[PDB]
Amino acid sequence: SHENSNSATEGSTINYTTINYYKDSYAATAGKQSLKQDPDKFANPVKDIFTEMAAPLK
Amino acid sequence: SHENSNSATEGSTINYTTINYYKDSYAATAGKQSLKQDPDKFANPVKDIFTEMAAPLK
Amino acid sequence: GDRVADVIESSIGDSVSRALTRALPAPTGQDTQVSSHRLDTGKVPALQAAEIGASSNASDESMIETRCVLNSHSTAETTLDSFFSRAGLVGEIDLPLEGTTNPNGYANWDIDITGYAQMRRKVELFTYMRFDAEFTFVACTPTGQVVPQLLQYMFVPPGAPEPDSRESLAWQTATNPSVFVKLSDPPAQVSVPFMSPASAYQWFYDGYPTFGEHKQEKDLEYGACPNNMMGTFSVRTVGTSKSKYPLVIRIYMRMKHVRAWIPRPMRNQNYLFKANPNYAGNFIKPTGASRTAITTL
Amino acid sequence: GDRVADVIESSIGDSVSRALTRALPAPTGQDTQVSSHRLDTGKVPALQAA
Amino acid sequence: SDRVAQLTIGNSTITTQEAANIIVGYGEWPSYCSDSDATAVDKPTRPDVSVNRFYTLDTKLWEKSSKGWYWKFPDVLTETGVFGQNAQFHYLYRSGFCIHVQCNASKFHQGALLVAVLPEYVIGSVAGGTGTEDTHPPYKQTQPGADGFELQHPYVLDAGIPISQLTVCPHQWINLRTNNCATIIVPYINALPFDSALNHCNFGLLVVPISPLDYDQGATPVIPITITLAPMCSEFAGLRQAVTQ
Numbered sequence: 237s238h239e240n241s242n243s244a245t246e247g248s249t250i251n252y253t254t255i256n257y258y259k260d261s262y263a264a265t266a267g268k269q270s271l272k273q274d275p276d277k278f279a280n281p282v283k284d285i286f287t288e289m290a291a292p293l294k
Numbered sequence: 295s296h297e298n299s300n301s302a303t304e305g306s307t308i309n310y311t312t313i314n315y316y317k318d319s320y321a322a323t324a325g326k327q328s329l330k331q332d333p334d335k336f337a338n339p340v341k342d343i344f345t346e347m348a349a350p351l352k
Numbered sequence: 353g354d355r356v357a358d359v360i361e362s363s364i365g366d367s368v369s370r371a372l373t374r375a376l377p378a379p380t381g382q383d384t385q386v387s388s389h390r391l392d393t394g395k396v397p398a399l400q401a402a403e404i405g406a407s408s409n410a411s412d413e414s415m416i417e418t419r420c421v422l423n424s425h426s427t428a429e430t431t432l433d434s435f436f437s438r439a440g441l442v443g444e445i446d447l448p449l450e451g452t453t454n455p456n457g458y459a460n461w462d463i464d465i466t467g468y469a470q471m472r473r474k475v476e477l478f479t480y481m482r483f484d485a486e487f488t489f490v491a492c493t494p495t496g497q498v499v500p501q502l503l504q505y506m507f508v509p510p511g512a513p514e515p516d517s518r519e520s521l522a523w524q525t526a527t528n529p530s531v532f533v534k535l536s537d538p539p540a541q542v543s544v545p546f547m548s549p550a551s552a553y554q555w556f557y558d559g560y561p562t563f564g565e566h567k568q569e570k571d572l573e574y575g576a577c578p579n580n581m582m583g584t585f586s587v588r589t590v591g592t593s594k595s596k597y598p599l600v601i602r603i604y605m606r607m608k609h610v611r612a613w614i615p616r617p618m619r620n621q622n623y624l625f626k627a628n629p630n631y632a633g634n635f636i637k638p639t640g641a642s643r644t645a646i647t648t649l
Numbered sequence: 650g651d652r653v654a655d656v657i658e659s660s661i662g663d664s665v666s667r668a669l670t671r672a673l674p675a676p677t678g679q680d681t682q683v684s685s686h687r688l689d690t691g692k693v694p695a696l697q698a699a
Numbered sequence: 700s701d702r703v704a705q706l707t708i709g710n711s712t713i714t715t716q717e718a719a720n721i722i723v724g725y726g727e728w729p730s731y732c733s734d735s736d737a738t739a740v741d742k743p744t745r746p747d748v749s750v751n752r753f754y755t756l757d758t759k760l761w762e763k764s765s766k767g768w769y770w771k772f773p774d775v776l777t778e779t780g781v782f783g784q785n786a787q788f789h790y791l792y793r794s795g796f797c798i799h800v801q802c803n804a805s806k807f808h809q810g811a812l813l814v815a816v817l818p819e820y821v822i823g824s825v826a827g828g829t830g831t832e833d834t835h836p837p838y839k840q841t842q843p844g845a846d847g848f849e850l851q852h853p854y855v856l857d858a859g860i861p862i863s864q865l866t867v868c869p870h871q872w873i874n875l876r877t878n879n880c881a882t883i884i885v886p887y888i889n890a891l892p893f894d895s896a897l898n899h900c901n902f903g904l905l906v907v908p909i910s911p912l913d914y915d916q917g918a919t920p921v922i923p924i925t926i927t928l929a930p931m932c933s934e935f936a937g938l939r940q941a942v943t944q
């Protein structure tokens with residue numbers, strides 16, 4: 237089970253579970269990702285965040 | 295897992311990881327080598343080594 | 353018994369090799385350190401002396417002002433296995449229905465890997481090699497179609513009787529290894545060990561195999577290394593009568609478990625003969641490309 | 650905030666003047682010491698380089 | 700210091716005052732064969748001081764249009780002194796070498812020499828010019844002896860291999876501006892613990908002028924080149940009668 241660390245997703249925060257039979261790590265299966273989202277990075281990219289209950293402009 | 299010790303790289307300093315299904319050890323895979331270099335043996339084959347900062351001929 | 357001082361204190365017999373250099377692990381490229389300006393006399397790393405025979409050892413940090421780079425580029429792909437463990441064509445055997453080359457339905461191919469330039473240039477970068485092999489036999493007709501034919505391959509080590517016909521008795525293979533395979537099947541693949549009487553194959557051999565007068569007839573012995581003569585590879589179509597299809601066989605070799613010694617300059621001329629470094633004398637060409645002037649691109 | 654090595658280890662901003670020389674008090678002229686002959690090789694104070 | 704040197708071995712001594720250090724071939728000193736690597740059963744002989752000494756073979760003239768020369772080892776010594784006698788009388792052979800090349804001129808002469816050691820230096824032929832002829836080098840070209848032989852195509856080294864890459868081999872430069880001598884120490888190079896000293900040649904020594912010799916009219920025009928060499932840690936085995944070749 238000693239193989240090269242040469243997949244496209246090495247040096248990433250999330251870890252997969254995959255099956256490999258060769259010494260090169262990019263030959264493995266796609267596997268399962270981890271379910272994490274950051275919707276604010278596109279939906280609410282403001283400097284000073286404001287609460288729902290108030291008026292955005294005051 | 296009892297096999298003959300008849301590969302081409304027996305009696306060598308470096309060890310490999312390989313996969314074999316037969317009793318002869320030269321039928322296995324190429325595997326992974328170890329990453330060691332001796333560049334001085336070709337680049338700096340002098341008797342008395344000299345520092346970078348000085349003059350080679352004094 | 354040693355009693356004289358020059359024998360007691362003698363250094364004869366030291367069988368260990370004094371090594372001036374040692375191997376150090378290097379999984380990635382070397383990092384770059386921070387550097388600053390320097391204005392002083394007596395300490396000059398820019399000036400060298402190429403006469404000694406050593407490569408100049410001035411680095412980046414001693415010549416220009418540099419930043420710190422954390423180099424993580426792997427060196428794994430330039431190893432000997434990574435460079436050599438790739439298959440390539442080394443021989444072709446032709447089995448025509450009518451012809452003068454192999455008219456009887458059988459052929460003998462002496463095993464040598466200096467028949468094709470792509471493999472020969474790669475293997476001749478070094479002087480000695482010790483490796484294992486992996487041979488693959490791809491068979492097809494001249495139009496490239498696959499047909500229901502049964503073939504036999506036989507490995508004949510030196511000293512064994514070479515077959516002389518398709519009905520020769522040597523095909524009983526009581527001791528020689530052999531392969532029976534059909535063209536409809538995937539190509540045959542076998543693994544071969546290191547077979548030299550010496551510790552390595554040498555692609556260059558500056559000598560003759562025998563003593564005696566070196567006359568004109570006894571001149572081809574130059575460069576002929578007996579230790580690289582590994583026997584013959586014999587092929588035939590199984591049957592008592594003549595076959596129905598003309599067949600072509602291509603052999604592919606893949607090295608593994610490699611060790612190499614004594615690098616030498618790469619070839620820059622066209623090859624002419626096998627096991628013979630001769631070159632066309634009247635048609636010598638430069639190693640690289642040329643340009644009109646030295647001051648222009 | 651400094652995070653890169655070439656900024657952390659940088660020498661930019663040194664406002665102090667490096668002085669190779671220092672002032673020493675000299676109220677009177679310098680005295681003369683006793684001297685004798687010298688006959689040796691390698692040590693020559695007469696020869697200079699202007 | 701570094702520019703001055705003195706090499707003493709056996710009953711001979713070489714002094715120099717314009718050295719450029721010493722090159723050790725592949726970073727390894729010559730040595731004897733160990734008990735785990737030897738294969739023959741008889742006891743080899745080690746004559747020691749009578750064979751390990753400096754031999755001066757011959758002198759060559761450097762001109763403005765010279766192309767180069769090569770020498771084969773140990774063919775240069777197969778017929779010189781006690782070493783030659785032992786090499787003729789015995790079947791096996793094993794030794795290293797210490798090569799010193801002498802070439803001196805004035806401060807008003809210029810030029811450069813490349814001195815290199817190439818193992819298994821097989822010499823190829825011109826193949827009849829067009830290349831359809833299967834020729835092999837004659838005896839005087841493959842085994843020139845102690846008199847050396849001159850290169851015909853120094854750009855290819857008579858083997859189809861470029862001279863620009865000859866520096867991957869153990870080498871030194873003789874640049875008349877800086878030095879006037881070169882020293883390379885070669886261990887035993889072979890795939891066999893012992894080999895014949897008469898049939899097999901281990902390596903070849905190349906001396907090719909990369910920068911042409913040039914001087915003004917009136918200066919000395921005769922600039923010789925000299926080769927001096929000493930076997931190191933010599934062994935011999937398989938004693939029988941002597942054979943000429």
Ligand SMILES: CCCCCCCCCCCCC/C=C/[C@H](O)[C@H](N)CO
Binds near residue numbers: 464465466553582
């Ligand atoms: C039934 C098996 C048939 C396949 C036979 C293949 C065996 C090949 C023999 C060993 C090959 C060794 C590799 C090359 C060695 C020598 O250096 C070359 N001849 C160089 O000329």
